[PDB]
């Protein structure tokens, strides 16, 4: 068991080293994609009765949050302009599409 | 509509279960089996809610442990009832 | 003096004190209200064991 | 006279439910705080 | 079931008997004390039957004497008329003549034409039935065997017998016949039944030897009446007992040799009958667990009042069974104003009780 | 569909008015219908069942319409809104009750009864009270209602304080 | 605690299960407690000694199980679409929860199972269903706050609850109908306030408890049995039977004290019309109780002949008629009760 | 007078007492069906 | 998962195809009144032969369910043991098993399997 | 697609369930339903842990009672009707082609499988059941498990009290 | 959470039965609420938790946010049905899988 704990911890120690690099290259794409995602939400409801991007016809979806508070969009919203091929490519990876 | 696209299927099944629970059957076994289907649907509604919840998920066991006990009690009284009258047939009621 | 007489006690004593075509029809007054079960005949299962049998 | 006053006050105190008395329904965050504590207890504990 | 003679001595109770005569039994008490622990070989009920004037009281006395059971003397109709200080309410003359004046077996034998006879005809069944529960009480508490000379199960024989003679009413026959079911379901049938079989003439020989100024000179003793016992015993009464209890039939008591009867009974064992439980014979005695033993025990050591209250059956459709209100009111006045009936037994200090002003005790199933 | 009988003058919008009543009439009609078709009539088949539902519902439509129109007729012509107006309203309703029931006496007596009902109803409408007003008080327990806790978990301090802001 | 030792066990588990409900924090916990009640009660109700007990068991189980099924289901919906146990307002999400609870406690439109039950139940088993199997669903009804449904229940909680009682000759069914009427008063009282509802149920528990507890004692199961039941004097036949009028709560019987309390607070809410209806029906409730008391008010009736003595348990009788004496002279304790202020 | 109240009331009560017994002299399927219908009505009205 | 799902569907389809194939490969014979009777060692079957359902096998399977559910309760102990607080995980689990033993040993003294019938 | 196909299969089997009246045919129908519901809840869950669990309790053990006591058999075997099968096939297919048509995403649940959680989530990189089943054993929410086991103990005390009616 | 009337020692089992708060983004909103419910009771608090209940519900409930998407994508389809969107423009670009 000492040997099993030995190598598992090594994985976990090697694990922590890697992780921030993934997060770093992760943040850029999140902000890049959000920029584009807001652009399309603006450019697709050009002619809509009262559309207000990031809200529901006026009132904000969230209000108790102070201003300049970024709330990550739910997964579906993040994919609001995407095909199944994109959607499944991440969703059905446990199931191995 | 959220419920119409998400919580609708559980409704339609649940109502169909109840109607079969109040239909006409030679004995009560079809009834017990009917409510048993309802339990599975009951689990279905329960889990999608517990899935809204990060860790409250575990409450499945509580519901499952209780539900199987209802079924066991259900079969308990029925089987004792055949043994009493030599039958548990709805004509005896 | 009039005292409660068997006629007055027969006012009640049906399954319904105002008996109707059905309640007056069938009556089930087990006084004790604890009716003993009556044993049935539990016929057993029959096996023609053998001849074709090791 | 005092009885009429009591009813009037009881009318107001029920309408608004200001005061922690007959027309109050105390709530409890204790159980949520307790679960908050359990979450705290086990976060620091994670990992051998 | 086994005789002392083959024991080379007396039988012993396997465990300390429970004072059921003077102590109440509780469900708490059942948890605190087990039931079948005391039970032994002889824990069984040997009922006797025979045509009237068969002298079986001496037989059963000796049989219980040399097999170590209880005798439990026969019907004692007088006990209705007896009290804490003995005297007969029959003493009370026909102040209230119509349906308050007494009726003993003497009165029946002198005249069964009186509708008031039906009174004891059912009250006599109750006395048997109450005795039977006493026997079950003694069994389940002490574990000791019992022997009842006659049983409520057998009482209907005389019932249909008297009715066939015409003495009872068509109404009364229905009343008793349906009413048996109500209570008779709630008793355990005896393990063993011994029936004695003389012909009608032969019993007339012996009843003329009883020399009883209220029987031997009486008129009821037609062959038809004393024979109806024979047919009813032979088929109607026996068969159901023949289903449950083991049935032995010797010729009769007089030639009935006790020792061979002792040996024949002892030869008939019941470990042989410890086979499949579902067997209908001995059926009413298959108690699975000690808990179920205690259920039967508590049901008789703590529910005798419940057992009596089954008798509360409303039937005001039979005149002879109805009582006149105001006369009945006076009948209440006589009984509870008469000596030694004002209070509960032991509290009739008018008739002598002392130790009152502090006494607050009451006996298990103490009458009232 | 959605109208109120008693939110308009007592002589205007007959059609909207009857609708605001007929809805509260049909509710009772079909409500009793499903209640009794399964108890007594039990007429096997769907047309027979349609018959019982029709038999039950129509008369209550007759009651409501008769009451409404007679009383509406009164205000239109009698020119007043009185307890008596609803009284003739109730008389007409029970007259329809006798007509359908084919029991002359039963209809007339109920017509008197329904007139009393309308009388009291008008009294509510005009005296500013109601049969089932909302509650002014709703109590939740004794004065120590806050003090009836018997729990045995230690509660760490709160995240909120009653004390005034210190900024 | 009727015959066996297991009676104590199942009663205990039952108590714990129901106590969970009344102390339950969330709907799910309350549902949990309710099912535990469902378990613990079925074996007591389903005696293995007779038949009628067993048929009552399927009906009780086959009804309660559906009630719990619907209750939890409607809970999820409410506590989905509102994402919170205490919805902002009562909508269609919530009426179903009451309809579950009303059936579980046997309220007005959902009652038919409840009379059919009584045939099977013995006395104290009936008693125990009468009193305790109605706490939890009612205390939950407290949390639900739909005025109109309770009001329709209260309207219909006496009409059938008394009209049927007029018709029944089996004491088992009469107690059913008697309580459905009384249940009408609890439901209204709980719509008004809870402290008064708590009191009224308790006095109802007390009264029903003593009532059926003597019927158990003497095993009187049919109006004929009441007329025929021997008593030495035919005076205590009458002294004991005052309680049948304490059912109606006529002032010198202590049943008035709760009915007065509910009436006082209810009219303080100004639902005068509702009081009139319930209180009109109360007379019909008291009507058949006099129909019962023809057995004892007059004395010295026509009786059966064979009985000579009447007997009963020490423990049950000793407890019983202490409770009766209070039902006789209870009012003068006006001071002793201080929970009304 | 007494016909308007009096005995006639007790006459009509017996009529309705008989009726309620006919309701209650049936099979448990019918009553559960009532409840199912009551549920079903409320469910669709939530949707509507 | 659905990789598993598809494989199972494929197998089941191949399975039924094989048995479907054997159903055509095996030669047919003209049916016979007696060839299609229940086998009772060559002596005529009795009346319906539907066994009595007065028996214990449901009782044993009910013991199964109780222990089968209890097994469910104790399954997750493997993973949580690394995370949970040790006192609670220790005592909580220990009393599970302890109560099981006591239930078992108490029940041997009851001896419920040694029924009279 | 799998999710909505699985709805379709559950719908079709449900229609099968409400038609079939032979007890085995019903009990068979439950069996299929259970596999389907286990599949479906698994998809929307963090993992299939609970699916395996309720499979072996509900189906694996507890439906054995239902089939076994419903071995009454009707005294005779099925008269299978190829028509309801064909309708079952027919209803399945155009539901299936509609499933091919329906909106790929919006017709899907929104729940967060382990994959559909964000990458940054440091908690998600543990054993999939570790953090979910944590508080089933850790205080003060673990005593309820003790209540479960004693409930099951009491359940057996009940079964031997009901299943022991004189035999 | 609806208030147990008696609050006896057996609320101690199910009160913390299942908690929104722990390890939940909505949990922060639960605390923002449940403190106020403690401050204003359960009836005045239910009156004066407008924003608190709105956001708490929105976080877990996702009603407002999710329904915004549903109309948002329906409107994409609606223009396609009117024919504005053709085989290419009918969908946008795929987010890099390593995002979100
Ligand atoms: C392939 C193996 C076939 C095994 C099954 C079989 O025996 O089929 C037999 C059948 C012809 O056999 P046979 O019965 O002798 O002739 C027809 C009688 N009317 O076979 C055939 O008729 C078809 C053989 C096609 C080659
Ligand atoms: N009406 C009626 N009389 C009975 C019944 N059983 C017994 N008797 C009457 C008939 C007898 O004359 C009398 C009892 O006399 P026995 O013949 O029993 O005296 P025996 O020599 O048998 O000894 P013993 O009575 O036991 O002391 O009581 C009964 O069931 N109904």
UniProtKB/Swiss-Prot annotation, chain B:
It catalyses: a ubiquinone + NADH + 5 H(+)(in) = a ubiquinol + NAD(+) + 4 H(+)(out). It is found in: Mitochondrion membrane. One of its GO terms (biological process) is mitochondrial electron transport, NADH to ubiquinone. Its EC number is 7.1.1.2. Its main location: mitochondrion. The chain crosses the membrane at residues 2-22, 28-48, 62-82. Gene3D superfamilies: 1.10.287.3510. The keyword Magnesium does not apply. One of its GO terms (molecular function) is NADH dehydrogenase (ubiquinone) activity. The keyword Cell division does not apply. InterPro entries: NADH_UbQ_OxRdtase_chain4L/K, NUOK/Mnh_C1-like. One of its GO terms (cellular component) is mitochondrial inner membrane. It is an enzyme of class 7 (translocase). It is a multi-pass membrane protein. Belongs to the complex I subunit 4L family. Core subunit of the mitochondrial membrane respiratory chain NADH dehydrogenase (Complex I) that is believed to belong to the minimal assembly required for catalysis. Complex I functions in the transfer of electrons from NADH to the respiratory chain. The immediate electron acceptor for the enzyme is believed to be ubiquinone. This is NADH-ubiquinone oxidoreductase chain 4L. It comes from Drosophila melanogaster. The gene is mt:ND4L.
From Swiss-Prot, chain E:
One of its GO terms (cellular component) is cytoplasm. Its main location: mitochondrion. Transmembrane segments: none annotated. InterPro entries: Deoxyribonucleoside_kinase, DNK_dom, NDUFA10, P-loop_NTPase. It comes from the Eukaryota. It is found in: Mitochondrion matrix; Cytoplasm. Its cofactor is FAD. Pfam families: dNK (PF01712). Expressed in muscles (at protein level). Disruption phenotype: RNAi-mediated knockdown leads to loss of ND-30 and reduced mitochondrial membrane respiratory chain NADH dehydrogenase (Complex I) activity. Larvae exhibit elevated reactive oxygen species (ROS) and an up-regulation of Hsp60. RNAi-mediated knockdown in the eye results in retinal degeneration exacerbated with aging and accompanied by high levels of ROS and accumulation of lipid droplets in the glia. RNAi-mediated knockdown in neurons results in lipid droplet accumulation and increased levels of peroxidated lipids. Binds 1 FAD per subunit. Belongs to the complex I NDUFA10 subunit family. PANTHER family: DEOXYNUCLEOSIDE KINASE, NADH DEHYDROGENASE [UBIQUINONE] 1 ALPHA SUBCOMPLEX SUBUNIT 10, MITOCHONDRIAL. Complex I is composed of 45 different subunits. This a component of the hydrophobic protein fraction. Forms a complex including sicily, ND-42 and Hsp83; the complex is necessary to chaperone ND-42 in the cytoplasm before mitochondrial import; the interaction between sicily and ND-42 is direct and occurs preferably between the unprocessed forms in the cytoplasm. The gene is ND-42.
Curated annotation (Swiss-Prot), chain G:
It is found in: Mitochondrion inner membrane. Keywords: Electron transport, Membrane, Mitochondrion, Mitochondrion inner membrane, NAD, Respiratory chain, Translocase, Transmembrane, Transmembrane helix, Transport, Ubiquinone. It is a multi-pass membrane protein. One of its GO terms (cellular component) is mitochondrial inner membrane. Its EC number is 7.1.1.2. It comes from the Eukaryota. Changing residue 182 to Y: In strain: Japan. Belongs to the complex I subunit 2 family. Core subunit of the mitochondrial membrane respiratory chain NADH dehydrogenase (Complex I) that is believed to belong to the minimal assembly required for catalysis. Complex I functions in the transfer of electrons from NADH to the respiratory chain. The immediate electron acceptor for the enzyme is believed to be ubiquinone. This is NADH-ubiquinone oxidoreductase chain 2. The gene is mt:ND2.
From Swiss-Prot, chain J:
Keywords: Electron transport, Membrane, Mitochondrion, NAD, Respiratory chain, Translocase, Transmembrane, Transmembrane helix, Transport, Ubiquinone. It is a multi-pass membrane protein. It comes from the Eukaryota. GO terms for cellular component: mitochondrial inner membrane; mitochondrion; respiratory chain complex I. The chain crosses the membrane at residues 24-44, 53-73, 82-102, 143-163. One of its GO terms (molecular function) is NADH dehydrogenase (ubiquinone) activity. The keyword tRNA processing does not apply. This is NADH-ubiquinone oxidoreductase chain 6. It comes from Drosophila melanogaster (Fruit fly). The gene is mt:ND6.
């Amino acid at each position: 068991a000492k040997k099993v704990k030995r190598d598992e911890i090594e994985m976990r120690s090697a694990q922590n080293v890697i992780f921030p690099i993934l997060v770093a290259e992760r943040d850029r794409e999140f902000l890049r994609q959000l920029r584009r995602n807001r652009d399309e939400e603006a450019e697709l409801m050009k002619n809509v009765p009262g559309w207000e991007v990031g809200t529901w016809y006026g009132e904000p979806v969230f209000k108790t949050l102070p201003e300049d508070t970024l709330v990550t969009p739910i997964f579906k919203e993040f994919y609001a302009h995407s095909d199944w091929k994109s959607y499944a490519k991440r969703a059905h990876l446990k199931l191995w599409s | 509509m959220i419920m119409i696209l998400y919580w609708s299927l559980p409704m339609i099944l649940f109502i169909l279960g109840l109607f079969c629970f109040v239909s006409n059957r030679k004995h009560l076994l079809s009834m017990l089996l009917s409510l048993e289907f309802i339990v599975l649907m009951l689990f279905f509604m329960l889990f999608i809610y517990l899935n809204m919840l990060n860790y409250e998920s575990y409450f499945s066991m509580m519901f499952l442990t209780f539900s199987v006990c209802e079924g066991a009690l259900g079969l308990s009284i029925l089987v004792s009832m055949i043994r009493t009258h030599g039958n548990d047939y709805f004509q005896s009621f | 003096k009039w005292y409660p007489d068997p006629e007055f006690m027969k006012q009640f004593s049906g399954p319904v004190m105002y008996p109707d075509e059905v309640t007056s029809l069938w009556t089930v007054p087990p006084w004790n209200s604890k009716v003993t079960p009556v044993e049935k005949s539990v016929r057993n299962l029959t096996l023609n064991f053998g001849p074709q049998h090791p | 006279q005092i009885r009429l006053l009591e009813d009037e006050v009881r009318r107001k105190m029920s309408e608004r439910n200001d005061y922690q008395a007959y027309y109050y329904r105390p709530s409890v965050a204790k159980y949520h705080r307790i679960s908050k504590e359990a979450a705290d207890e086990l976060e620091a504990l994670r990992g051998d | 079931i086994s005789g002392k003679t083959m024991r080379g001595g007396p039988r012993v109770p396997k465990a300390a008997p429970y004072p059921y005569k003077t102590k109440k039994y509780s469900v708490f008490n059942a948890i605190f004390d087990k039931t079948s622990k005391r039970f032994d070989e002889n824990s069984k009920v040997i009922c006797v039957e025979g045509p009237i004037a068969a002298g079986k009281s001496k037989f059963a006395k000796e049989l219980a004497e040399e097999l170590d059971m209880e005798y439990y003397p026969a019907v004692d109709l007088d006990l209705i008329y007896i009290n804490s200080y003995g005297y007969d309410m029959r003493k009370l003359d026909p102040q209230l003549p119509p349906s308050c004046r007494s009726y003993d077996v003497r009165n029946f034998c002198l005249d069964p034409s009186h509708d008031l006879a039906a009174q004891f005809q059912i009250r006599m069944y109750m006395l048997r039935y109450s005795q039977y529960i006493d026997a079950l009480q003694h069994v389940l508490s002490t574990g000791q065997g019992v022997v009842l000379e006659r049983s409520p199960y057998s009482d209907f024989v005389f019932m249909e017998a008297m009715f066939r003679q015409g003495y009872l009413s068509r109404g009364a026959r229905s009343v008793y016949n349906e009413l048996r079911q109500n209570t008779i379901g709630e008793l355990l049938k005896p393990h063993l039944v011994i029936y004695l079989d003389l012909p009608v003439d032969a019993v007339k020989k012996q009843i003329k030897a009883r020399n009883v100024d209220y029987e031997v000179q009486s008129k009821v003793f037609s062959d038809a009446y004393l024979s109806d016992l024979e047919q009813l015993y032979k088929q109607q009464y026996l068969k159901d007992i023949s289903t449950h209890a083991e049935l032995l039939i010797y010729d009769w008591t007089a030639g009935g040799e006790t020792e061979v009867v002792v040996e024949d009974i002892e030869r008939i064992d019941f470990n042989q009958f410890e086979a499949d439980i579902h067997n209908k014979k001995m059926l009413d005695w298959r108690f699975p667990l000690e808990a179920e033993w205690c259920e039967a025990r508590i049901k008789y050591c703590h529910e005798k009042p419940d057992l009596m209250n089954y008798f509360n059956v409303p039937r005001f459709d039979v005149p002879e069974l109805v009582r006149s209100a105001d006369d009945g009111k006076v009948w209440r006045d006589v009984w509870f104003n008469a000596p030694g009936m004002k209070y509960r037994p032991g509290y009739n200090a008018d008739m002598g009780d002392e130790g009152l002003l502090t006494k607050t005790k009451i006996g298990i199933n103490q009458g009232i | 569909l959605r109208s109120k009988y008693y939110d308009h003058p007592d002589g205007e919008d007959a059609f909207g008015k009857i609708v605001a009543t007929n809805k509260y009439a049909v509710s009772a009609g079909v409500a009793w219908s499903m209640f009794d078709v399964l108890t007594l009539s039990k007429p096997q088949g769907y047309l027979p069942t349609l018959g019982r539902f029709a038999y039950n519902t129509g008369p209550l439509m007759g009651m409501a319409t008769a009451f409404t129109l007679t009383t509406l007729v009164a205000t239109n012509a009698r020119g007043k809104d009185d307890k008596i107006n609803y009284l003739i309203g109730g008389f007409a309703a029970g007259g329809v009750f006798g007509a359908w029931k084919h029991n002359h006496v039963a209809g007339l007596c109920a017509g008197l009864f329904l007139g009393i009902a309308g009388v009291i109803k008008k009294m509510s409408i005009e005296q500013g009270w109601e049969f089932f007003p909302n509650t002014p008080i709703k109590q939740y327990g004794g004065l120590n209602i806050a003090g009836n806790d018997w729990t045995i978990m230690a509660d760490p301090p709160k995240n909120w304080t009653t004390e005034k802001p210190k900024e | 605690m009727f015959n066996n030792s297991s009676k104590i066990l199942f009663i205990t588990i039952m108590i714990i299960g129901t106590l969970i409900t009344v102390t339950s924090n969330s709907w799910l916990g309350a549902w949990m407690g309710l099912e535990i009640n469902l378990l613990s009660f079925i074996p007591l109700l389903s005696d293995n000694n007779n038949l009628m007990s067993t048929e009552a068991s399927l009906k009780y189980f086959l009804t309660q199980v559906l009630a719990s099924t619907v209750l939890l289901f409607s809970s999820i919906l409410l506590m989905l679409k509102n994402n919170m146990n205490n919805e902002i307002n009562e909508s269609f999400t919530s009426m179903i929860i009451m309809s579950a609870l009303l059936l579980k406690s046997g309220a007005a439109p959902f009652h038919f199972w409840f009379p059919n039950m009584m045939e099977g139940l013995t006395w104290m088993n009936a008693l125990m269903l009468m009193t305790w199997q109605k706490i939890a669903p009612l205390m939950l009804i407290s949390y639900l706050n739909i005025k109109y449904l309770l009001l329709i229940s209260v309207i219909l909680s006496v009409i059938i609850g008394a009209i049927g009682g007029l018709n029944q000759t089996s004491l088992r069914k009469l107690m059913a109908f008697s309580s459905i009427n009384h249940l009408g008063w609890m439901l209204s009282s709980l719509m008004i306030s809870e402290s008064i509802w708590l009191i009224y149920f308790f006095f109802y528990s007390f009264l029903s408890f003593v009532l059926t507890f003597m019927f158990n004692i003497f095993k009187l199961f049919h109006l004929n049995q009441l007329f025929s039941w021997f008593v030495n004097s035919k005076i205590l036949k009458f002294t004991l039977f005052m309680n049948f009028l304490s059912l109606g709560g006529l002032p010198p019987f202590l049943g008035f004290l709760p009915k007065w309390l509910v009436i006082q607070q209810l009219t303080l809410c100004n639902q005068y019309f509702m009081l009139t209806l319930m209180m009109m029906s109360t007379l019909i409730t008291l009507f058949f109780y006099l129909r019962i008391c023809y057995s004892a008010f007059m004395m010295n009736y026509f009786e059966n002949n064979w009985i000579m003595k009447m007997n009963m348990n020490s423990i049950n009788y000793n407890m019983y008629m202490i409770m009766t004496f209070f039902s006789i002279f209870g009012l003068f304790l006006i001071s002793l009760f201080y929970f009304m202020f | 007078s007494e016909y308007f109240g009096g005995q006639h009331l007790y006459q009509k009560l017996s009529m309705y007492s008989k009726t309620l017994f006919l309701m209650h002299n049936n099979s448990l399927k019918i009553y559960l069906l009532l409840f199912v219908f009551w549920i079903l009505i409320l469910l669709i009205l939530l949707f509507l | 998962m659905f990789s598993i799902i598809f494989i199972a569907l494929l197998i089941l389809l191949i399975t039924t195809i094989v048995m479907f194939l054997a159903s055509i490969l095996s030669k047919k014979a003209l049916i016979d009144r007696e060839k299609s009777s229940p086998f009772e060692c060559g002596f005529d079957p009795k009346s319906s032969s539907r066994l009595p359902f007065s028996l214990r096998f449901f009782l044993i399977t009910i013991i199964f369910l109780i222990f089968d559910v209890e097994i469910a309760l104790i399954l997750p102990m493997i993973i949580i043991m690394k995370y949970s607080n040790i006192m609670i995980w220790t005592i909580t689990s220990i009393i599970f098993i302890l109560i099981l033993l006591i239930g078992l040993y108490h029940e041997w003294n009851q001896g419920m399997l040694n029924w009279s019938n | 697609m799998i999710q909505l196909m699985l709805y379709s299969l559950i719908i079709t089997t449900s229609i099968i369930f409400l038609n079939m009246i032979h007890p085995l045919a019903l009990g068979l129908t439950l069996l299929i339903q259970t596999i389907f519901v286990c599949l479906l809840t698994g998809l929307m869950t963090k993992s299939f842990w609970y699916s395996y669990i309720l499979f072996l309790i509900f189906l694996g053990g507890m439906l054995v009672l239902f089939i076994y006591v419903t071995s009454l058999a009707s005294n005779e075997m099925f008269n299978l009707s190829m028509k309801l099968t064909l309708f079952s096939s027919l209803i399945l297919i155009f539901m299936l082609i509609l499933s091919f048509i329906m909106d790929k995403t919006s017709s899907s649940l929104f729940l967060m499988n382990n994959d559909m959680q964000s990458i940054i989530n440091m908690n998600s990189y543990f054993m999939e059941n570790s953090l979910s089943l944590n508080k089933l054993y850790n205080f003060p929410t673990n005593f309820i498990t003790i209540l479960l086991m004693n409930y099951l103990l009491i359940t057996l005390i009940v079964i031997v009290k009901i299943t022991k009616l004189f035999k | 959470s609806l208030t147990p009337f008696l609050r006896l020692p057996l609320t101690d089992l199910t009160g913390c039965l299942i908690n929104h708060q722990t390890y939940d983004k909505c949990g922060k909103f639960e605390m923002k609420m449940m403190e106020c419910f403690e401050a204003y009771g359960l009836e005045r608090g239910k009156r004066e938790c407008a924003d608190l209940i709105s956001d708490f519900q929105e976080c877990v409930g996702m009603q407002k946010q999710l329904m915004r998407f549903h109309a948002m994508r329906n409107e994409r389809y609606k223009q396609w049905l009117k024919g504005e969107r053709k085989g290419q423009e009918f969908f946008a670009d795929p987010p890099r899988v390593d995002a979100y």
